[PDB]
Amino acid sequence: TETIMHANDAIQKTTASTRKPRLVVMVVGETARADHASFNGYQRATFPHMDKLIGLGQVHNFGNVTSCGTSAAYSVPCMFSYLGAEKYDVDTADYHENVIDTLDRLGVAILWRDNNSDSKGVMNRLPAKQYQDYKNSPLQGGNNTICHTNPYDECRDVGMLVDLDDHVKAHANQDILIVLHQMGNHGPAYYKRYDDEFAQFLPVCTSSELAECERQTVINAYDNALLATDDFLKQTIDWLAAQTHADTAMLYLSDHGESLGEKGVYLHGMPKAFAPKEQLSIPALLWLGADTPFAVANSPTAGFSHDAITPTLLNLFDVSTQATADKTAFVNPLD
Amino acid sequence: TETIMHANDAIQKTTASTRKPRLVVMVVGETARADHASFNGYQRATFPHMDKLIGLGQVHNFGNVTSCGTSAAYSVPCMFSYLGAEKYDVDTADYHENVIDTLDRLGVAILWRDNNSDSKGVMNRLPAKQYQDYKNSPLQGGNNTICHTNPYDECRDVGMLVDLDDHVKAHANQDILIVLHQMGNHGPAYYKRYDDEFAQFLPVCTSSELAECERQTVINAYDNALLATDDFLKQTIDWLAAQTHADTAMLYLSDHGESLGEKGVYLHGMPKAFAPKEQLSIPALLWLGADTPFAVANSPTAGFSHDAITPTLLNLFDVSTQATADKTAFVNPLD
């Protein structure tokens, strides 16, 4: 009763009872920036798995996408909002219906796994059991079974992929959205972000005081963490490709980019008014399953931004509402 | 170290190994405003239990206190920060060591129970099991056993007091801090916030369109929710009074106030440079146990604010750090 509604008219045009169930994984990345992706022209092979799938036509790359801000606190709630970046007031985002609320009201079975921090309020109106902490191991009070593969005891993003079949089997003949919130490229200690298999650009910086290390060694650790994210996305897609009774999709966007020493600036979090372009420039990818019914939108005049996520998610679940009239999306609506 | 440190020099002057363990309950209230508390002169007995304890000298009233902002998203992280309101940056509060991080490092056993939303990042570095969701019942994925006493199935703040003895028993001979984050006076549906026992100021507004109801009936439901918070604070104190083995304290402050129709303004969330006084004026109370060693501090000339919380918590746990010099606190350090 106490929510500012945006999509009270929302209804599904078709349901899992009259066509194949829809199964979407939305990956909320962390600190990855567009121009260190090989698929956007970076001079190093940072996403070999995604590049191969792009060459096969399975993954669609949207190029240099713009985040709404330079921090998770700002970007993550706005990513799932109806307000968009221009009218978004990070302070009062929680008073509004968000796109997760709409999908849950229409019967989509939502799971949010988090190896980062939390959903920044997005999940607060749904039952607590639909949100799972994956930045802690079970004895620490969380769920991630892949935290002891490295000397930092840091939980890994691929632990969020363990037995997602549980959720799918609990929700037969239902549309499903799974949100995975990555640790990704968070710094400054990039060398802690990936297991040794991905320690490929060398040597790396092994200190949290970035200014002290040499700039190239900071970049090397950052690009190694991208390699681990490329693998995590590949394993996510491999799991979806085995769900042959559903129509599947994986959408991936980072929450913001990262400065890597341009004009001496490192990290992120700068007020958007004068943040450098590197902090606002993010990768964006969409994978679609075999025999997909969906059509990918072409990059419009203005390019894409975080504002396209909410209409995309509504389109992937066939939701009709005036709330998305004339709004950019990564996928066209079906009719 | 990926954390911006503020109290790296912190050390306890004495420990539970050489004096009585310290046991502190910090209540983070919600939407209660100073001038509707009967202990600040409101012409209605909204806090009858606290008023009796104030008359006995057991509760100290700090009068009209100022919150740092007009929403929980802004105020809650700042309440636990070292930066204080004037340097605080809500987007990047999470990058900084906060007072809970300091207490945890020094060995205080911290429990955060939340019947509101969550800790707004404050608990993110501590093990997940030290944070408990109390706005959901157990079958919903939370912990609160008192959600079915009302027709809205709304979880009640007193459910957070159920069997706190479990936490105390698990931390024998340790200092303990318990944070209880209230649902409290959140609106606009004030009439949902309290069980029938507290439906005392009548008639009440039973709609969410507050500008439609008669103003006094909105005020009546708001004041009923205060009665239920007064009762919750009394039950909290009654539990602490039974921990005779420890030196105890209860500190209570709201996250912000509330407009109740003055010049047509309702609810809160206005930008703090422009917000009316009602949204920034909050109650603040301190209860101390029998034979307390602590003394109430000199009032700042402008009155107290949220900035006093962090130095107060440090002083209550005998923590010595340069980060408290020059800073306001509700109680003096022991020396």
Ligand SMILES: [Zn+2]
């Ligand atoms: Zn981020």
Ligand SMILES: [Zn+2]
């Ligand atoms: Zn609040």
